[PDB]
Amino acid sequence: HKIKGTVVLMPKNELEVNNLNAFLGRSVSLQLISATKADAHGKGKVGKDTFLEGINTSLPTLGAGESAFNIHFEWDGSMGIPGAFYIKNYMQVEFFLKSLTLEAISNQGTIRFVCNSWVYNTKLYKSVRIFFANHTYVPSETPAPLVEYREEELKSLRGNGTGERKEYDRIYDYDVYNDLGNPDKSEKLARPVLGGSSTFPYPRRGRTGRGPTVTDPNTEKQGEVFYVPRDENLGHLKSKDALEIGTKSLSQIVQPAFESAFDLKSTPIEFHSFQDVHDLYEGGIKLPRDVISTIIPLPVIKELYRTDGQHILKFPQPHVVQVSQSAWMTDEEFAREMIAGVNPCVIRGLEEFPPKSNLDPAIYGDQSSKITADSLDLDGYTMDEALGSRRLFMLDYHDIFMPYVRQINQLNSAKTYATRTILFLREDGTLKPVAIELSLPHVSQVVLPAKEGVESTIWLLAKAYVIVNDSCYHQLMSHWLNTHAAMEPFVIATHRHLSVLHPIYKLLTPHYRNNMNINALARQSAINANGIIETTFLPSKYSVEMSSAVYKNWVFTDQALPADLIKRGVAIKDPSTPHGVRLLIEDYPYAADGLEIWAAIKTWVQEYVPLYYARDDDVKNDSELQHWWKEAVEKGHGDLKDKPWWPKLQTLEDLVEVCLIIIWIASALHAAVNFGQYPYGGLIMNRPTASRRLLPEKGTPEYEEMINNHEKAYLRTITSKLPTLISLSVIEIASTHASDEVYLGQRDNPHWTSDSKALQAFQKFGNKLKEIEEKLVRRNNDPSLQGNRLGPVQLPYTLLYPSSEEGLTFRGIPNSISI
Ligand SMILES: [Fe+3]
Numbered sequence: 001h002k003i004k005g006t007v008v009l010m011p012k013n014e015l016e017v018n019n020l021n022a023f024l025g026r027s028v029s030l031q032l033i034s035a036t037k038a039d040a041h042g043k044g045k046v047g048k049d050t051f052l053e054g055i056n057t058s059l060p061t062l063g064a065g066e067s068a069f070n071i072h073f074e075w076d077g078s079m080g081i082p083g084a085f086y087i088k089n090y091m092q093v094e095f096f097l098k099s100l101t102l103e104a105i106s107n108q109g110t111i112r113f114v115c116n117s118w119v120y121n122t123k124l125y126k127s128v129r130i131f132f133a134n135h136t137y138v139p140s141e142t143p144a145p146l147v148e149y150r151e152e153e154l155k156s157l158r159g160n161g162t163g164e165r166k167e168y169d170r171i172y173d174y175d176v177y178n179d180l181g182n183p184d185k186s187e188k189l190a191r192p193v194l195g196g197s198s199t200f201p202y203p204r205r206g207r208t209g210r211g212p213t214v215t216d217p218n219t220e221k222q223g224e225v226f227y228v229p230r231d232e233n234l235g236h237l238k239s240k241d242a243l244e245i246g247t248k249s250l251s252q253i254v255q256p257a258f259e260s261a262f263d264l265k266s267t268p269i270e271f272h273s274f275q276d277v278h279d280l281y282e283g284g285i286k287l288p289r290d291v292i293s294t295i296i297p298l299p300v301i302k303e304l305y306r307t308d309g310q311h312i313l314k315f316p317q318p319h320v321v322q323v324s325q326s327a328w329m330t331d332e333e334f335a336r337e338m339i340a341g342v343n344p345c346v347i348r349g350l351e352e353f354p355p356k357s358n359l360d361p362a363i364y365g366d367q368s369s370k371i372t373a374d375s376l377d378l379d380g381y382t383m384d385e386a387l388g389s390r391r392l393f394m395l396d397y398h399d400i401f402m403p404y405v406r407q408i409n410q411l412n413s414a415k416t417y418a419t420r421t422i423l424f425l426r427e428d429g430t431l432k433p434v435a436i437e438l439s440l441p442h443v444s445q446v447v448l449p450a451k452e453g454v455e456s457t458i459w460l461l462a463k464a465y466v467i468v469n470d471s472c473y474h475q476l477m478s479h480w481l482n483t484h485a486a487m488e489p490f491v492i493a494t495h496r497h498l499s500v501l502h503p504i505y506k507l508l509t510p511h512y513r514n515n516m517n518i519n520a521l522a523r524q525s526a527i528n529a530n531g532i533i534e535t536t537f538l539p540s541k542y543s544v545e546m547s548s549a550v551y552k553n554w555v556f557t558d559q560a561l562p563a564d565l566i567k568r569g570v571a572i573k574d575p576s577t578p579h580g581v582r583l584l585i586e587d588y589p590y591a592a593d594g595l596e597i598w599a600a601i602k603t604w605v606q607e608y609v610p611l612y613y614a615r616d617d618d619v620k621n622d623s624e625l626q627h628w629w630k631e632a633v634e635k636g637h638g639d640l641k642d643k644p645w646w647p648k649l650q651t652l653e654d655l656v657e658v659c660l661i662i663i664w665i666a667s668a669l670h671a672a673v674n675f676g677q678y679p680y681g682g683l684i685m686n687r688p689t690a691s692r693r694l695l696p697e698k699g700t701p702e703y704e705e706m707i708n709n710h711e712k713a714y715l716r717t718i719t720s721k722l723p724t725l726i727s728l729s730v731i732e733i734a735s736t737h738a739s740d741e742v743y744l745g746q747r748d749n750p751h752w753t754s755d756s757k758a759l760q761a762f763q764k765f766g767n768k769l770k771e772i773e774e775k776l777v778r779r780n781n782d783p784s785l786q787g788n789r790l791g792p793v794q795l796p797y798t799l800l801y802p803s804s805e806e807g808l809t810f811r812g813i814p815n816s817i818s819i
Pocket of ligand 1: 670
């Protein structure tokens with residue numbers, strides 16, 4: 001009585017960015033664990049230590065880097081049916097275990113194990129590594145002999161809340177954002193703790209445990225590597241797919257190299273004309289040979305530029321200029337990008353006029369808008385008519401930015417206004433900007449559109465100040481806070497409280513791939529003190545703190561797409577429509593395409609949940625699920641735990657809602673705000689990240705310059721040349737799909753569950769996404785929708801096409817927040 005098995009694994013050398021016979025002998029042991037026969041203590045019986053016997057070269061299903069090994073277990077009639085196994089690696093080097101498959105007389109009796117886990121030397125683990133077969137069980141359905149194993153593995157994953165975490169640990173826990181400052185290096189690099197107070201609320205991040213700095217016991221000391229639990233950093237076969245490593249290289253190597261070129265006056269310090277910026281993707285920028293030779297050897301980085309190996313670095317041409325070099329300058333495109341650009345989810349309907357501020361007048365005085373209704377050209381509408389017909393909209397950054405303008409403007413090389421933009425929905429269905437208000441605290445001018453004269457340059461600059469607001473809000477709030485930061489606590493809670501066996505674990509975990517990893521690298525190099533974001537975006541050392549102020553108002557249930565639209569007053573509830581909302585901007589590309597994706601995910605969740613939960617009772621009674629959600633709210637988002645809007649998770653309908661929102665944030669929402677960054681923002685004049693001066697005052701040389709040289713006046717106002725080179729490089733990385741991405745509708749292994757009904761439902765989901773993609777292609781070819789879906793830049797809105805090939809494609813929805 002012997003069971004034949006096949007082990008598939010990848011040796012360490014295949015998944016690194018920087019011999020098989022050794023696996024034979026007594027170097028790798030496996031022990032099967034019975035699911036049906038228990039020892040005296042009720043635990044599944046354990047078989048004998050069994051070793052890898054030989055290499056299996058005649059296996060066609062092997063992928064790149066994968067090796068298969070034969071094994072033969074002795075398993076007599078007393079042992080029952082296997083359901084789990086132990087593995088002990090006695091080698092000195094870790095390997096990546098993929099799968100164990102046990103053969104049976106019939107092909108239906110095959111038992112499959114999907115592992116996908118790094119296995120380190122047995123002496124490094126407190127308890128032996130255990131893996132379960134791919135059967136799905138809610139806790140009350142677990143075979144009795146596996147219950148204790150299920151419960152103890154979860155205990156292992158939680159740890160005890162103490163200790164410095166090491167590379168091989170698989171311990172998931174929470175901590176505050178106290179690791180961004182670097183006070184032990186310089187007092188000026190001190191940063192506030194974010195999280196754990198009502199003054200600075202914030203989502204938690206993964207605990208690393210390096211301990212305190214010497215100069216501040218509340219700030220965590222720096223480390224060369226920021227830990228994540230080992231299997232959150234899976235590796236890649238090809239180095240060019242390790243995109244997440246790029247920010248570290250940009251900060252530590254590339255940025256110092258660029259800076260030396262500017263210190264040595266080897267290239268002009270400023271752009272002088274728009275052509276100087278267009279040159280970056282045409283002929284390139286010429287840099288010294290020792291700078292080029294430092295950059296081009298680096299993995300990942302070298303893929304960002306074309307070079308001649310001597311003096312030229314050339315950036316790729318951004319989509320937004322691929323047809324028209326100038327269309328970005330039009331009012332039409334400015335407005336269109338608020339519904340179809342990199343940041344499409346901030347605009348709000350106006351139901352009253354003038355707009356009002358909620359700012360404390362004791363501190364900020366009267367903040368009532370100074371825009372008058374009669375100054376606006378609404379194509380012949382009166383204000384009463386345009387309001388009543390819901391044609392007026394705004395991009396309102398006044399109350400968000402005003403509390404920080406004084407502090408920002410005290411920086412030596414930042415100056416900003418808090419802005420409002422008024423939009424009118426024309427009879428042809430496109431948006432028209434009709435006024436911009438530029439405000440300063442104690443101080444407020446209204447700028448109207450103009451096409452001729454010095455007033456047209458002032459209007460151009462006013463649009464730049466608006467997009468500096470918008471770029472900062474996009475990066476820190478729409479992107480970093482709402483997707484990256486908000487999701488990490490749910491990742492942590494899932495691994496701590498839902499068994500790998502659990503149906504909701506299997507539903508959600510594909511939507512977490514690489515999230516903790518990219519976030520930890522971001523804490524180290526992107527959002528740290530003097531990191532990429534602080535040295536490229538307007539608010540400098542205030543950048544992350546500003547996102548904490550916005551998190552005060554973050555509402556989980558308002559992240560659902562229909563709720564968000566209604567809240568922002570860009571849709572109304574309408575049960576006579578497919579999706580239950582009527583779009584007041586009917587053509588709104590992000591929202592109209594997003595609703596299709598939303599509905600597809602909804603159908604998938606509503607078809608998967610009832611396979612495992614028949615009644616509300618089954619949700620209430622699932623102890624893992626209840627512990628998971630309690631911890632996600634009370635610890636992971638614990639600064640908001642008291643808010644009344646958290647779902648209680650006592651019904652089927654709550655479980656669906658929670659899972660749907662999580663999946664939406666991690667896939668389509670992140671994709672829509674992330675993968676258009678270089679396509680729209682690769683031209684720095686279209687998406688400036690910073691402003692450096694206020695408007696010229698009449699009678700000064702800066703004002704005279706504005707009359708005689710509008711391009712120089714514009715370039716002096718926005719992001720300087722050196723930070724432009726950095727910020728372009730980092731948004732080029734972020735806009736790139738790695739070749740090993742897993743997209744919505746895909747999974748990394750087809751045998752993630754043995755439940756044929758769940759597999760069929762998942763197949764239906766993938767088929768529906770292909771049907772939706774064809775629908776969205778038809779929309780982009782529809783001449784009636786050209787005004788908003790293509791615009792004067794002639795750039796089809798493809799950001800919610802579910803599929804994509806590798807590269808910088810402006811399309812494709814990953815499962816997760818992976819970059
Ligand atoms: Fe991202």
